[PDB]
């Protein structure tokens, strides 16, 4: 109903994050939480060791709980109490590490700036969900992990549809003609 998932997530080593470099290198363990991304229609991601989770005896899945009625936001308003929000947020501790990340130098008027580009999971989720309903077979696909990909994320495990990559190939100039 309300608690059991919450205490199951807390007792086991669960963590919430939105930007991570694991899609580039699996060896990194840097996780940070950003303030700006809180919103009604922003997507998040979670990690637990062994990627076990729990299974309902009646039969339930992780995806459905996020988008049914938004119960945790419905309690966020303060109808039932304010204690549980702090209870949940207290487990979100961020770690910093830059090893095995690219460095890019960028020019800003007079001077330099060093940057480390990172990806967003919400972009992937939105793109896949919006393209999966229009029957647009104009993308590549790729699976992470490799030999043992089920221990990395549930994305390779459960939804076999595949990720969507934009085809940025421009047309070529046909030779032996004016154009």
């Amino acid at each position: 109903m309300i608690k059991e998932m919450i205490e199951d997530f807390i007792s086991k080593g669960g963590l919430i994050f939105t930007h991570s470099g694991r899609y580039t290198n699996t060896n990194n363990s840097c996780f940070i939480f950003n303030k700006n991304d809180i919103g009604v229609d922003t997507k998040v991601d979670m990690y637990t060791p062994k990627s076990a989770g729990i299974k309902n005896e009646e039969g339930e899945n992780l995806w459905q709980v996020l988008n049914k009625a938004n119960m945790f936001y419905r309690i966020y308003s303060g109808e039932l109490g304010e204690e549980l929000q702090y209870l949940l947020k207290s487990c979100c501790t961020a770690k910093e590490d830059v090893t095995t990340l690219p460095q890019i130098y960028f020019k800003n008027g007079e001077g330099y700036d060093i940057l480390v580009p990172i990806g967003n999971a919400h972009n992937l989720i939105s793109g896949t969900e919006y393209l999966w309903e229009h029957k647009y077979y104009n993308t590549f696909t790729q699976k992470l992990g490799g030999s043992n990909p089920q221990n990395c994320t549930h994305a390779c495990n459960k939804m076999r549809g595949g990720f969507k990559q934009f085809n940025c190939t421009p047309p070529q100039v046909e030779d032996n003609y004016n154009a």
């Binding site: 020019k107 940057l115 580009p117 990806g119 967003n120 919006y130 030999s147 421009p170 154009a179």
Partner: protein, 248 residues
């Protein structure tokens, strides 16, 4: 505007197509900006306008799951397991033939600049690529805006990249108008406190994320006015066009 140097049919090999975690294909213009500022700091000339074109571009592989490179053991954590099936780390590559057209102002000579720019190009990289063969760069002269069309009659044929604008947000607009995204710049989010493993101990460390803009690949003759294809550095680490919104 006084002097333009043009290099055509530049063969680049083994381009790293994984620009980001979601964008694979044409490299972003931020690498062009970085190479331009590197040329500015190395040669010593301030450059304002940047132009480039696409001639050939082939991605290694097929319609999906293009190419995978076998990576071997290069870390000091091996010795027992380092005898079979090194980790995979999927990263596709590509091949291409491009061209460049740059503006330069210099009045001490006319050919020493060609010498040094050729020397620098001979020892450069293109998004992980490698220059294979290139034509001899040639020089063009321009004076002001009305005669600018002359240059479009000087270096045909190629494609051009033009801005068209976005309405509210691109999540559905990109599919609706069936154009291609591209990373116009980076937006800073927080500051990296640690200064241990950086390549420098004085440059400030910031964390940023890409921002997406709309560009389109068309014919030069189909472009009514050329100023839509100029790139100028803007406020908040952005790049803008001189002509603004496209209109008929």
């Amino acid at each position: 505007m006084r002097k333009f140097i043009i290099v055509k049919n530049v063969k680049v090999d083994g381009i790293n197509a994984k620009s980001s975690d979601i964008t694979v294909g044409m490299p972003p213009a931020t690498t062009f900006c970085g190479l331009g500022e590197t040329m500015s700091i190395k040669t010593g000339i301030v450059v304002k306008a940047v132009s480039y074109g696409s001639v050939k571009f082939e991605v290694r592989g097929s319609r999906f799951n293009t190419s995978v490179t076998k990576f071997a053991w290069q870390d000091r954590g091996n010795g027992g397991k380092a005898n079979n099936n090194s980790p995979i780390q999927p990263k596709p590559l590509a091949d291409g033939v491009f061209t460049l057209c740059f503006e330069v102002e210099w009045e001490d000579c006319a050919e020493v600049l060609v010498d040094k720019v050729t020397n620098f190009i001979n020892t450069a990289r293109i998004a992980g690529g490698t220059i294979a063969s290139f034509n001899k760069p040639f020089v063009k002269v321009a004076k002001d805006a009305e005669e600018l069309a002359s240059v479009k009659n000087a270096m045909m044929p190629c494609y051009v990249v033009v801005d068209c604008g976005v309405e509210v947000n691109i999540f559905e607009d990109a599919v609706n108008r069936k154009l291609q995204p591209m990373v116009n710049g980076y937006k800073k989010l927080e500051k990296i406190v640690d200064n241990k493993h950086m390549r420098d101990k004085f440059t400030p460390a910031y964390l940023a994320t890409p921002t997406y803009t709309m560009i389109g690949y068309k014919m030069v003759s189909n472009v009514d006015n050329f100023d839509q294809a100029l790139w100028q550095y803007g406020e908040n680490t952005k790049v803008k066009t001189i002509g603004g919104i496209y209109n008929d």
